[PDB]
């Protein structure tokens, strides 16, 4: 006769969803002076994080079911919006613009400011990008801001930063994160090299389109993951084993004017350019890009055919879909990126100040003018591809970019209490 | 046959060893704006999980015990496997899933058939 016995501390778990919390590096605590994501309201990371490799644990993973992506979706948007609550409405500035060309990507516009200094009116001028404003059809000399008839746009408070600090996300007590350490593992299915993680590595909240950058290189080969590689409704995520260097710049030493439009209220606008007008652009090593791209094809052809023609020029969607984009030095560049795919490298880039947190509903944020020149560089580490076997760059939203990193982990809940039959009866 | 071992891994998931072997590390497992909201909820959940296990161990009279035996016999209708088949040839992760549907049954039996009954019998004996 076997008897019921209770065992506590049983090493089992069930898959579960909970909230992960942030953990900061060291510096982020004191970056509150400007940085939105690198907040002071965040505990530190573990200076000596542990990891345990499990011997016989094999589990199913599915990156497209990874709920951590939703948490990152909401957190970035919420934090970004919170930081803009005290910022300046540009509503009264949309009233009028009399424009000529800058002495036409950039317009030199004069304007009439409505009662400002209590009982006074004033006139000013500023430089505007053609991507932020549009002409009046029956004038062709007068302009308005594009988003004015839908919603409010504010100018980010000058004391702001979006530096993409690699914040870590940690599980609460009672929970653990299991990591798939199988370098050849695709987006779904079983993984045998599994380890227990209490907290993940830091992930930079990088915002970009048509580019995976500044992290997560592949294990000495191009690694491609997709929900199917079959269905045209699905997309392909490409990891490179080597990064490709890109150097971007906006070589215009610009200044900015503070315009007061009433006592107690003001905003900044692009002022005069110190020096000549230089085109924003980015330098991509051609050989590295195309040598890598040849290697990408070597991996891609495994699913799509050995003589299959792949990788054509960007096409489809509006200019923010078609052009490649990033915040270089905080400045927003929209690059044609067709040279990279002009065969199945320096690109021109355009500048725009009205931006979305990936995509807003109605509202938008205005990027204050930046004094001086823009210089930055980065590591190209991957691609997202569009099915047509022609592939084109782009597609998806922030969750596809978050997923491209989060695919390594899943969350489980520890279930330590259970029973089993024994030969031992309770004594009384 | 040389006794080399008695080492520590950590975590010890119930796949790496059998239920019998796994029982040797119960102390291991035991040892193991919006931001405010998250800090709060995280702490609340940790408390809730902790207490739920303690509440069950409490009512069963198994508080403070890694292992406790009850007054309730095993019913083969829950599982008709032998002691060896369960303890030496299976790990907890696989085995528990087979009787998951009897959890509330057994938990209830080990409360009333054991402590309510045992304590009433003993209280009466102690009045003499």
């Amino acid at each position, epitope marked *: 006769q076997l008897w019921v016995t209770v065992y506590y501390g049983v090493p089992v778990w069930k898959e579960a969803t909970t909230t992960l919390f942030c953990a900061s590096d060291a510096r982020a605590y004191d970056t509150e002076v400007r940085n939105v994501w690198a907040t002071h309201a965040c505990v530190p990371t573990d200076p000596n994080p542990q990891e345990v490799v499990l011997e016989n644990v094999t589990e199913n993973f599915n990156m497209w079911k990874n709920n951590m992506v939703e948490q990152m979706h909401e957190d970035i948007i919420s934090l970004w919006d919170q930081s803009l609550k005290p910022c300046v409405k540009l509503t009264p500035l949309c009233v009028t613009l009399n424009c000529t060309d800058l002495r036409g990507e950039i317009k030199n516009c004069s304007f009439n400011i409505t009662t400002s200094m209590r009982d006074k009116v004033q006139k000013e001028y500023a430089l505007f990008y053609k991507l932020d404003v549009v002409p009046i059809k029956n004038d062709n000399t007068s302009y308005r801001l594009i988003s004015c008839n839908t919603s409010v746009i504010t100018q980010a408070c000058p004391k702001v930063s979006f530096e993409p600090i690699p914040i870590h996300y940690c599980a609460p007590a009672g929970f653990a994160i299991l990591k798939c350490n199988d370098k050849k593992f695709n987006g779904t299915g079983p993984c045998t090299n599994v380890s227990t993680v209490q907290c993940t590595h830091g992930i930079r909240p990088v915002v970009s389109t048509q580019l995976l950058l500044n992290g997560s290189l592949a294990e000495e080969e191009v690694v491609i993951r997709s929900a199917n590689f079959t269905d045209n409704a699905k997309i392909i995520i490409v990891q490179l084993n080597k990064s490709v260097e890109i150097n971007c710049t906006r070589p215009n030493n610009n200044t900015r004017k503070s315009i007061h439009i009433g006592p107690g209220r003001w905003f900044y606008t692009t002022g005069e350019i110190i020096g000549d007008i230089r085109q924003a652009h980015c330098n991509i090593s051609g050989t590295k890009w195309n040598d890598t791209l040849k290697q990408i094809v070597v991996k891609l052809k495994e699913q799509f055919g050995n003589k299959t023609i792949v990788f054509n020029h960007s096409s489809g969607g509006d200019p923010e879909i078609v052009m490649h984009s990033f915040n270089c030095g905080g400045e927003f560049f929209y690059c044609n990126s067709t040279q990279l795919f002009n065969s199945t490298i320096v690109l021109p880039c355009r500048i725009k100040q009205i931006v979305n947190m990936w995509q807003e509903v109605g509202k938008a944020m205005y990027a204050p003018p930046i004094k001086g020149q823009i210089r930055c560089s980065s590591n190209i580490t991957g691609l997202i591809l569009i099915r047509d076997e022609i592939f084109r760059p782009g597609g998806g939203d922030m969750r596809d970019n978050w997923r491209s990193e989060l695919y390594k982990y899943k969350v489980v809940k520890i279930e330590p209490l259970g029973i089993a039959p024994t030969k031992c009866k309770r004594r009384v | *046959a040389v006794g*080399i071992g008695a*080492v520590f891994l950590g975590f010890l998931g119930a796949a790496g060893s059998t239920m019998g072997a796994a029982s040797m590390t119960l102390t291991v497992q035991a040892r193991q704006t919006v931001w405010g909201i998250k800090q709060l909820q995280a702490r609340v959940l940790a408390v809730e999980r902790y207490l739920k296990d303690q509440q069950l161990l409490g009512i069963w009279g198994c508080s403070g015990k890694l292992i406790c035996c009850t007054a309730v016999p095993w019913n083969t209708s829950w599982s008709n496997k032998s002691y060896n088949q369960i303890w030496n040839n299976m790990t907890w992760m696989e085995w528990e899933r087979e009787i998951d549907n009897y959890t509330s049954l057994i938990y209830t039996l080990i409360e009333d058939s054991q402590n309510q009954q045992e304590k009433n019998e003993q209280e009466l004996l102690e009045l003499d």
Partner: antibody
Amino acid sequence: EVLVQSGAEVKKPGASVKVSCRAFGYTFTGNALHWVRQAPGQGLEWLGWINPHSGDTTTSQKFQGRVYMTRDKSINTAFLDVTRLTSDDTGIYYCARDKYYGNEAVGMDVWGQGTSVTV
Amino acid sequence: IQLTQSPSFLSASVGDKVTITCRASQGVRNELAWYQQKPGKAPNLLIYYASTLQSGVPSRFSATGSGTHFTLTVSSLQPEDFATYFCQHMSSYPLTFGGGTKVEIK
């Protein structure tokens, strides 16, 4: 799970040598380590083993008071400490891991690359 | 542990059958580990508890025997197997290995 040993050494008789072995890819304290030596022209000589968790050791009778093992878990590294070196101590010093199923030696499938010591 | 091994010059051709014998005066019951080693390399395990084939070790390797007398058989010898072979005895310690035998070219 791999074992990584330090470099080679040249010593004169009467000297001592210390050979490290790092626990890459696995928990240092979760699997006991053996030390085995192979002098030129020789088969495999067991020197002893160390428990990375507790510090417990066993050594061959041949080396009592001569071969010692130590460990420092903060760097996941075990060490072989050999004194009174003589010409018979020329050889390859290897670190290795067993399965220790049931905490008893089974056989060793994970080996370091071995380092040489010349004496 | 008081182990006697087959003559070291165990010549064989590829696809041939070569065996290594490990017979000790002391019993280990089954606590014997079979190893394969190349010059310049650490020895590695083939068979444990005198009969369990380690995953990753080719199916051509098998072993028989008990108590004191164990034999390692390579049923279809390949070029990569022209290695030395050892037994390690675990009844007690020191857990030394035998002198080792070698498979030679026929």
